[PDB]
Design an enzyme around this catalytic site. Structure first.
Site, PDB file in Angstrom:
ATOM      1  N   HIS A 194       0.745  -1.062   0.251  1.00  0.00           N
ATOM      2  CA  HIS A 194       0.100  -0.003   0.284  1.00  0.00           C
ATOM      3  C   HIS A 194       0.692   1.689  -0.150  1.00  0.00           C
ATOM      4  CE1 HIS A 194      -3.916  -1.684   0.768  1.00  0.00           C
ATOM      5  NE2 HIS A 194      -3.749  -2.251   1.480  1.00  0.00           N
ATOM      6  N   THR A 217      -8.246   6.472  -2.772  1.00  0.00           N
ATOM      7  CA  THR A 217      -9.676   6.507  -3.529  1.00  0.00           C
ATOM      8  C   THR A 217     -10.787   7.468  -3.244  1.00  0.00           C
ATOM      9  OG1 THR A 217      -9.892   5.496  -1.014  1.00  0.00           O
ATOM     10  CG2 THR A 217      -9.114   3.994  -2.925  1.00  0.00           C
ATOM     11  N   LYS A 237      -8.803  13.960   3.512  1.00  0.00           N
ATOM     12  CA  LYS A 237      -8.524  12.605   3.615  1.00  0.00           C
ATOM     13  C   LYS A 237      -7.346  12.982   4.556  1.00  0.00           C
ATOM     14  CE  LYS A 237      -5.199  13.353  -0.296  1.00  0.00           C
ATOM     15  NZ  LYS A 237      -6.760  13.040  -1.141  1.00  0.00           N
ATOM     16  N   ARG A 238      -6.615  12.067   5.311  1.00  0.00           N
ATOM     17  CA  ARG A 238      -5.500  11.684   6.507  1.00  0.00           C
ATOM     18  C   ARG A 238      -4.549  13.272   5.927  1.00  0.00           C
ATOM     19  NH1 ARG A 238      -6.631   8.599  10.520  1.00  0.00           N
ATOM     20  NH2 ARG A 238      -4.395   9.356  11.858  1.00  0.00           N
ATOM     21  N   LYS A 258     -14.134   8.935  -5.897  1.00  0.00           N
ATOM     22  CA  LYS A 258     -15.236   9.275  -4.803  1.00  0.00           C
ATOM     23  C   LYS A 258     -15.865  10.640  -5.530  1.00  0.00           C
ATOM     24  CE  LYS A 258     -14.268   7.810  -0.741  1.00  0.00           C
ATOM     25  NZ  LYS A 258     -13.156   7.103   0.119  1.00  0.00           N
ATOM     26  N   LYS A 306       0.752  14.337   1.503  1.00  0.00           N
ATOM     27  CA  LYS A 306      -1.059  15.124   1.572  1.00  0.00           C
ATOM     28  C   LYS A 306      -0.602  16.665   0.867  1.00  0.00           C
ATOM     29  CE  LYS A 306      -3.712  10.525   2.785  1.00  0.00           C
ATOM     30  NZ  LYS A 306      -3.288  10.229   2.018  1.00  0.00           N
TER      31      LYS A 306
HETATM   32  C1  LIG Z   1     -11.775   7.443   0.476  1.00  0.00           C
HETATM   33  C2  LIG Z   1     -11.590   7.592   2.001  1.00  0.00           C
HETATM   34  C3  LIG Z   1     -10.472   8.169   2.383  1.00  0.00           C
HETATM   35  C4  LIG Z   1      -9.527   7.616   1.816  1.00  0.00           C
HETATM   36  O1  LIG Z   1      -9.302   8.808   1.316  1.00  0.00           O
HETATM   37  P1  LIG Z   1      -7.551   9.172   0.119  1.00  0.00           P
HETATM   38  O2  LIG Z   1      -8.155  10.305   0.214  1.00  0.00           O
HETATM   39  O3  LIG Z   1      -7.848   8.186  -1.214  1.00  0.00           O
HETATM   40  O4  LIG Z   1      -6.595   9.138   0.864  1.00  0.00           O
HETATM   41  C5  LIG Z   1      -9.894   8.008   3.851  1.00  0.00           C
HETATM   42  N1  LIG Z   1     -10.967   8.601   4.908  1.00  0.00           N
HETATM   43  C6  LIG Z   1     -12.369   8.456   4.464  1.00  0.00           C
HETATM   44  C7  LIG Z   1     -13.523   8.234   5.321  1.00  0.00           C
HETATM   45  C8  LIG Z   1     -12.813   8.108   2.987  1.00  0.00           C
HETATM   46  O5  LIG Z   1     -13.916   7.487   2.719  1.00  0.00           O
END
Ligand SMILES: *Cc1c(COP(=O)(O)O)cnc(C)c1O
Ligand SMILES: OC[C@H]1O[C@@H]2O[C@H]3[C@H](O)[C@@H](O)[C@@H](O[C@H]4[C@H](O)[C@@H](O)[C@@H](O[C@H]5[C@H](O)[C@@H](O)[C@@H](O[C@H]6[C@H](O)[C@@H](O)[C@@H](O[C@H]7[C@H](O)[C@@H](O)[C@@H](O[C@H]8[C@H](O)[C@@H](O)[C@@H](O[C@H]9[C@H](O)[C@@H](O)[C@@H](O[C@H]1[C@H](O)[C@H]2O)O[C@@H]9CO)O[C@@H]8CO)O[C@@H]7CO)O[C@@H]6CO)O[C@@H]5CO)O[C@@H]4CO)O[C@@H]3CO
Ligand SMILES: OC[C@H]1O[C@@H]2O[C@H]3[C@H](O)[C@@H](O)[C@@H](O[C@H]4[C@H](O)[C@@H](O)[C@@H](O[C@H]5[C@H](O)[C@@H](O)[C@@H](O[C@H]6[C@H](O)[C@@H](O)[C@@H](O[C@H]7[C@H](O)[C@@H](O)[C@@H](O[C@H]8[C@H](O)[C@@H](O)[C@@H](O[C@H]9[C@H](O)[C@@H](O)[C@@H](O[C@H]1[C@H](O)[C@H]2O)O[C@@H]9CO)O[C@@H]8CO)O[C@@H]7CO)O[C@@H]6CO)O[C@@H]5CO)O[C@@H]4CO)O[C@@H]3CO
Ligand SMILES: *Cc1c(COP(=O)(O)O)cnc(C)c1O
Lengths: 808, 808
Positions: free
Chosen positions: A349, A648, A540-541, A652, A546
């Protein structure tokens, strides 16, 4: 109300209402005059749950009879979110329940908001597990999700004085109606002890015992009557005990399943974490073998069992499987190893070094003595193979060893996984190539056949139908509802790009989502966003790679430009940044503070008006994502090229009608490739550019000296412009940016700002913005986790997916 | 099958069967082919539970409308035992369920044995609470049982090598279908902190907070459709949090409701115990007041509220009620105190000094600072009253003070209770008189009106109908079923004492019970008892005052006599002694070992044959009592006169057809008084005899020198006759018996042995033994907890009991 939401039905609705009342009366023990909203949620939850049981029992019955190859997905994380609405959707009961609850004088949406999120994950990795479970069930695979039932999931984030405050996520407090405790499948797990060598072979003895109790949660396929299982283990102390303390010390053993480690892409060599990793592995394997013997030679084991390792967290499955086969079943090492390699597969990952698991040898030595011996043996035979293939290449041997020398000897779990798996995959084409060209170059040259790519995906059920019914409907209105389980069909929307009616509908759904969300912010967060502005969101985190900071620089630039030419026109924007920072990651917490600090200056400047607002989305999680994503116009995916394995969230946003501004990183590359680069807002350095920048040396000062606007921003941060009472509050931010920025924020600043201007220019032309949006949605089909799972099934597990409905 | 067990009914039975299947399918999620016996138990348990809900909701509804005076029974113990069968009995569903389960091909008795005992008690005190709840519900009182929901009840006792081994009683492991969590009634409890004095009065601040979550359990009245509530509090940590540890430390706060202290009539000044006492008190009072304000002057509080303190364990209710009224409601002290005294009543359970609660002042000082100040103030005003009534009696003041001086200052909770309650009662006539003549003489002279007697009782539902259906039936056959809720009617059996048919039936039921139990011993304990012998049983907590040792001396005497005249005839006997020893009570554990040691010698002597067997009943508890009692012929109640406050096991044996051999102690006195001394086997010293023995000085040596048989026994114990490999194993037993026996075991030896001979002589005459038995059963009516509760209601709580059935 809406087509894709199922049929109501006279009988169906009156059947739900009566059952709703049975449960309120008999299960919750209450009447309408004392029932609390939570009571109503539970009555409905139990009612919907009842519609699962018949299918759940017959599905598990089916597998027993047909005895297909079983897929075991091991993960220490399952970011599930809420399950009430998801269950209704997959069962097509959504409209019926909406009607039945309506007739009973209850608003279903209000009831759904009462459900606690199952936050048993940190971010990407845990959500992928959740999406995969949904797809596996939707594709009729005999799959089982296996993990740990944490009493406390990811912490709830609260902002105080602009700072992040952590709060325990006590999600089981009011109870979980979805899980089913199965006390009769309790199994023992061993820790510590020592290895004794006898005539019959090695013996692990004098170990401390901890019991593993499983809790099963149903996983419904989409409208196919298949209900798979997610089994989560809970730690319990044995009953076999001055007296008071002994009883109270039982909590020590039960602390194994108490809390999820809140680290996102960062390794913590803590003992508790290792115990968790072995706990889930040992209990799961016994369950796997037990189920196997009920179909004694394990030569057929690989044909009936596939074990997928989600990252290196469950890597101990490899030496554990060996232990059982050798120490318990008495198979000879080589046979045992052949079996192990053929049943195990590993998914990588990330490539960042601080995320790699390297466990100290002394720890494995105390906690799992026998496993250490097995790992050493595996390493020996493995290096003998390398030595034979690359005679005299002594350096290669050091590099490939599962054992890393140094002050502290460690075990590289990622090396253990590659050696003991028949397949190793990256999660995005570019990430998989980087694994073969860098991190695992040596392994790739030794066994090129093991390496594969399996680009990530998201489930269109939760991430479209569930969170954006309005968009799902207008799409169904033109092409039908088949795409929901076959996203490629979304391409048919490509011939509606010039359709005036469609353009108006797509634009209207977005507008509605923005209005609904704009209100949400005022209700539970009393804010003041302008719904006519561009929704610029990065969720995102929080992490340096990032680059939420690059985003911050742009926001400060916009602000400074407005102040420079107050009466000049600029496309209004609502910038939203949300995400949790791991506790103890100082820099990450400083960034959250900086963001809120900017908002404090920007949001209260009379000259800015409502042309620019900066909002920090508190406690970002799955349920919040389901809300903010459908309402977004711009998706920020700006990680330094080569750092984000796949991502991911990006998928979305694309599926929900937002345009993407980002670097050629992770899946961004394949997305832009599918939609066409002209329909994407790509900017910044590519992987190679980062490479020749390092070879030359990154000097942030060079950018500071050549970019006036950048210089001003840095001076403002240093002078205390954003922290009046604490002038040097952000001295660390500036210091890191100027002297120790591993992620080259300044290097992409100019190109980022310019690209952002082209975004604004396009937003000014509603019709064309929407047409580009349609081109993104129309090509997001490839990123459905159904495609991803179908590839794993055929190219890794060796099983054929099926869409055949199971008898009702 | 049997009359007293309810009617079957076509509709009724087919209704149960279908519901049983609904639950197995929907609730347990299983089918007949995978269902485990435990699954069957749960399906039945949920089915029966469903028949309670309607009545439970309407009963609580009824009280809300009528708003009667409420009775709050505070206790840290509720020795409930199993509830499935009890619920069926009180609902008259026992035969129906038996039939329905029969038709489904299941043995109900087997299913009932699967239920875990709710062992939230140690012995007498906790069982009294349980019996009282049943009676209060059966008498239509608006009563609530309030206590703590311990995760672990009294430990499970296992014997290894003749020694007691403790095992955690994890009774909630498989779940509890009877309880209902009510998260919305969660309340905060405070600890530590400090007292701040302001203009508005005292303020308790900087306290640590622990949440109290209630779990309600239904308490069904006997066939009257009344279902009261037992609310048990559970400790939860607040959510408002390096990170991992903070989450794990939540267990510290939750350890308050983790385990029941295993002490029977013994005080342990541990902090955890005090926290438990305050926890149950603070949460209960808030609930009481809340419910009160929903009917603001508290002048009417005493007319709507009665608070019964089961011993001094919840004594903090007094200063807590004061705190709330003074510190929170702002009433003036005197008004507050008037209210407090009028609502609180106290029940004393023992006179032995080591059982009295005396909490160190420094502990109350740290944990409950404000409560200490309130206690001091209460003490001040109280001693001012004593000083005024008894001018110059300085010694009386020291004796009555709630505060005890010395190296360590302590608070006498029993003194606190007497001062703050309008009623103080003993639990047996003789015990109540002793309270007035000794321990509380000073208080009695100050306020003679507060002291009362309320002789204990047992519920005839669980202790007759439930555990001895055979005896309940043959009795119903002659006098009807009205006695079940009016035990006095049992007197009518007095005119059947010469009835040949009755004599044969009574004797046959006993024989059947003995056969069933005799088998039970072989099944789950593989033993070898002769069912034709006299069942001599002594079951109760192991304690020196209970004198299990005197029993042991008799058993050794019988053995020595047999060995002396092997071919002489003697009435065969199976001596059974069971009970748990508190951990850390060395002497108590030595006694268990001695008992098993005797059995080891006696049970394997060829010369003894099956004329004498010594069995130690392992893990004695409520469910075991329900089995051994109905099968007993002789009830051993031999505590030194003046030590057993009342006793309740004695009443259980009398009601079930066993004859009693005992001292004039506790309720034994009133029982013999009801049946007639000629129908009782009374022996030993009376209270006065113990008194003039102490004044003279107890010299055990005197008995040893004058009784040859006693001397031989002591020599055998010392020489190692009962411990061959460990000659001096019992040196401590002998030492205590010879030099430090507070309970004068030797003083009653001669009279005990002789009385035992008269018992044997009577057993030889079956017809006459049974006729005496009938005279005991026929007069055990007074010992029904219904009578006891009716007296508390009228003479203490000021409420009238009613037998009026509530609408179905
Ligand atoms: C989809 C999702 C992530 C992953 O987000 P990235 O921007 O790819 O890191 C993280 N947290 C939640 C709550 C998600 O729905
Ligand atoms: O379970 C196996 C052993 O596990 C444990 O050992 C681990 C180490 O603790 C850990 O540090 C790491 O080892 C690294 C090591 O520390 C580094 O120094 C380095 O070592 C490399 C070295 O620098 C290079 O020179 C080269 O070594 C070559 C060697 O010099 C050369 O002679 C030849 O080796 C041959 C031997 O000379 C010959 O005798 C024979 O060896 C047999 C052996 O006799 C037989 O018993 C069996 O091995 C046993 C072993 O004897 C036992 O002691 C036991 O070993 C365990 C250790 O005790 C643990 O501490 O069990 C073994 C069973 O496997 O079989 C041997 C043959 O397989 O043949 C040898 C031919 O290979 O060639 C080697 C070329 O490798 O390379 C070294 C490795 O790069 O790097 C090490 C790896 O990081 O990991 C150890 C486990 O892998
Ligand atoms: O909350 C009240 C106080 O609580 C706390 O005090 C407790 C003690 O710590 C604890 O040890 C125990 O007290 C025992 C004590 O330790 C033992 O020595 C013994 O004391 C007896 C003594 O040996 C006998 O002589 C006799 O005392 C008589 C006394 O000698 C005689 O003079 C007369 O007393 C009168 C006073 O002389 C007169 O001034 C007046 O007192 C007023 C007072 O002025 C007024 O403030 C108010 O009392 C206040 C008090 O002033 C504050 O200091 C505060 O006291 C608390 C303590 O600080 C805590 O440590 O608050 C009080 C509010 O109540 O009202 C007083 C009048 O009520 O009048 C006095 C007439 O009574 O007569 C006495 C006769 O008793 O008897 C002593 C008791 O037997 O035994 C003590 C009990 O075990 O408990 C204390 C709380 O009860
Ligand atoms: C009735 C009962 C008791 C009380 O027995 P006594 O002999 O009065 O001490 C103790 N334990 C259990 C399990 C009981 O049923």
């Amino acid at each position: 109300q809406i087509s894709v939401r199922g049929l109501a039905g006279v009988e169906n609705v009156t059947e739900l209402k009566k059952n709703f009342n049975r449960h309120l009366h008999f299960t919750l023990v209450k009447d309408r005059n004392v029932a609390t909203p939570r009571d109503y949620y539970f009555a409905l939850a139990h009612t919907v749950r009842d519609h699962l049981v018949g299918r759940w029992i017959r599905t598990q019955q089916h597998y027993y009879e047909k005895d297909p190859k079983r897929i075991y997905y091991l993960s220490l994380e399952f970011y599930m979110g809420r399950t009430l609405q998801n269950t209704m959707v997959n069962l097509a009961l959504e409209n019926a329940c909406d009607e039945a609850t309506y007739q009973l004088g209850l608003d279903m949406e209000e009831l759904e908001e009462i459900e606690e999120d199952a936050g048993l994950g940190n971010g990407g990795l845990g959500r992928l597990a959740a999406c995969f479970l949904d797809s596996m069930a939707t594709l009729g695979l005999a799959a089982y999700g296996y993990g740990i039932r944490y009493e406390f999931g990811i912490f709830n984030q609260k902002i105080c004085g602009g700072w992040q405050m952590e709060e325990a996520d006590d999600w089981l407090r009011y109870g979980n109606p979805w899980e089913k405790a199965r006390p009769e499948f309790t199994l023992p797990v061993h820790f510590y002890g020592r290895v004794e060598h006898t005539s019959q072979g090695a013996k692990w003895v004098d170990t401390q015992v901890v019991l593993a109790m499983p809790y099963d949660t149903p996983v419904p396929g989409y409208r196919n009557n298949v209900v798979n299982t997610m089994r989560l283990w809970s730690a319990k102390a044995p009953n076999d005990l001055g007296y008071i303390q002994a009883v109270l010390d039982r909590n020590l053993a039960e602390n194994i399943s108490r809390v999820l480690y809140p680290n996102d892409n960062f390794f913590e060599g803590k003992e508790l974490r290792l115990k968790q990793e072995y706990f889930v592995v040992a209990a799961t394997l016994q369950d796997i073998i037990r189920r196997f013997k009920s179909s004694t030679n394990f030569d057929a084991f690989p044909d009936k069992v596939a074990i997928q390792l989600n990252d290196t967290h469950p890597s101990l499955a490899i030496p554990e499987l060996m232990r059982v086969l050798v120490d318990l079943e008495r198979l000879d090492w080589d046979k045992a190893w052949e079996v192990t390699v053929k049943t195990c597969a590993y998914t990588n990952h990330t490539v960042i070094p601080e995320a790699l698991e390297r466990w100290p040898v002394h720890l494995l030595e105390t906690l799992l003595p026998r496993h250490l011996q097995i790992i050493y043996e595996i390493n020996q035979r493995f290096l003998n193979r390398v030595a034979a293939a690359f005679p005299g290449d002594v350096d290669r041997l050091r590099r490939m060893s599962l054992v890393e020398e140094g002050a502290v000897k460690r075990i590289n779990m990622a090396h253990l996984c590659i050696a003991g798996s028949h397949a190793v995959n990256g999660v995005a084409r570019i990430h998989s190539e980087i694994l073969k060209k860098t991190i695992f170059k040596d392994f790739y040259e030794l066994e090129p056949h093991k390496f594969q790519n399996k680009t990530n995906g998201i489930t269109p059920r939760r991430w479209l139908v569930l969170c954006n019914p309005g968009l799902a409907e207008i799409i169904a209105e033109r092409i039908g509802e088949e795409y929901i389980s076959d996203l490629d069909q979304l391409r048919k929307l490509l011939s509606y790009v010039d359709d005036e009616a469609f353009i108006r509908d797509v634009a209207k759904v977005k507008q509605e989502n923005k209005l609904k969300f704009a209100a949400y912010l005022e209700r539970e967060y009393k804010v003041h966003i302008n719904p006519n502005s561009l929704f610029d969101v990065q969720v995102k985190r929080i992490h340096e790679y990032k680059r939420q900071l690059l985003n911050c620089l742009h926001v400060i630039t916009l602000y400074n430009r407005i102040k420079k030419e107050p009466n000049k026109f600029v496309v209004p924007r609502t910038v939203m940044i949300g995400g949790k920072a791991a506790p103890g990651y100082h820099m990450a917490k400083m960034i959250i503070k900086l963001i809120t600090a900017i908002g404090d200056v920007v949001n209260h400047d009379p000259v800015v008006g409502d042309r620019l607002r900066v909002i920090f989305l508190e406690n970002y999680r799955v349920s919040l994502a389901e809300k903010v994503i459908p309402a977004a116009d711009l998706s920020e995916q700006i990680s330094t090229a080569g750092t984000e394995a796949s991502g991911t969230g990006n998928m979305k946003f694309m599926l929900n009608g937002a345009l993407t501004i980002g670097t050629m990183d992770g899946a961004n590359v394949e997305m832009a490739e599918e939609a066409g680069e002209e329909n994407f807002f790509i900017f910044g350095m590519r992987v190679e550019d980062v490479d020749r920048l390092d070879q030359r040396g990154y000097n942030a000062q060079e950018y500071y000296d050549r970019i006036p606007e950048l210089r001003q921003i840095i001076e403002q941060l240093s002078s205390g412009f954003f922290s009046p009472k604490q002038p040097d509050l952000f001295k660390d931010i500036v210091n890191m940016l100027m002297h120790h920025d591993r992620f080259k924020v300044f290097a992409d600043y100019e190109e980022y700002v310019k690209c952002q201007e082209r975004v604004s220019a396009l937003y000014k032309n509603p019709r064309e913005w929407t047409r580009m949006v349609i081109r993104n949605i129309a090509t997001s089909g490839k990123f459905s986790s159904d495609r991803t799972i179908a590839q794993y099934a055929r190219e890794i597990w060796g099983v054929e997916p099926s869409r055949q409905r199971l008898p009702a």
